[PDB]
C-alpha cells in the first residue's frame, strides 16, 4: 500500500442537537454532552483492521488545542476501501463560549507499508 493512500472526512454531532458544520450548543446544554464523530473513509486497504482513535480538542483563540477526551476502536475497512465508522466520546462537560474540534487517526493493526 502507498503510504500516501487514504482519506478521513469527519462530521461531529451532539445527541438531541440538529445543528451541523458547526454544531452549536446553548450555554445551558453543556453538562454531560454525548459527542459522536462520523468517519467517512476512502482508499484504505479493503478488509484490513484499523485502530481508529478520535480526540475531542478544546481550540483556544490563539489556535493551540488541549485534548479533553479520546475514544479508540478496532474497526475493519469495507473490502472496497470506502465506508463509514461511528465514534462516540464518554459524556463531557463543555464550557460556555468555548470552541471544540475532533481529530481522527486510523492505523492498520498490520504493517502494510
Amino acid at each position: 500500500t502507498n503510504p500516501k493512500e487514504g482519506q478521513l472526512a469527519t462530521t461531529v454531532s451532539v445527541k438531541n442537537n440538529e445543528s451541523t458544520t458547526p454544531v452549536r450548543l446553548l450555554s445551558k446544554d453543556t453538562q454531560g454532552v454525548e459527542v459522536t464523530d462520523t468517519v467517512s473513509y476512502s482508499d484504505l486497504v479493503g478488509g484490513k483492521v484499523y485502530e481508529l482513535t478520535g480526540t475531542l480538542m478544546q481550540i483556544k483563540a490563539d489556535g493551540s488545542t488541549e485534548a479533553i477526551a479520546s475514544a479508540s476502536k478496532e474497526v475493519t475497512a469495507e473490502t472496497s476501501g470506502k465506508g463509514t465508522w461511528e465514534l462516540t466520546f464518554a459524556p463531557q462537560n463543555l464550557k460556555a463560549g468555548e470552541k471544540y474540534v475532533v481529530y481522527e487517526v486510523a492505523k492498520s493493526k498490520e504493517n502494510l507499508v
Partner: peptide, 23 residues
Amino acid sequence: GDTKHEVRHENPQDEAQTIVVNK
C-alpha cells in the same frame, strides 16, 4: 512492509468537526 498504514484527519479549522458553545 516495516510499518503501519496511518491516515489522519487533524484539521483544527474543519467546521464539520467543530462544536461552538454560546454565552
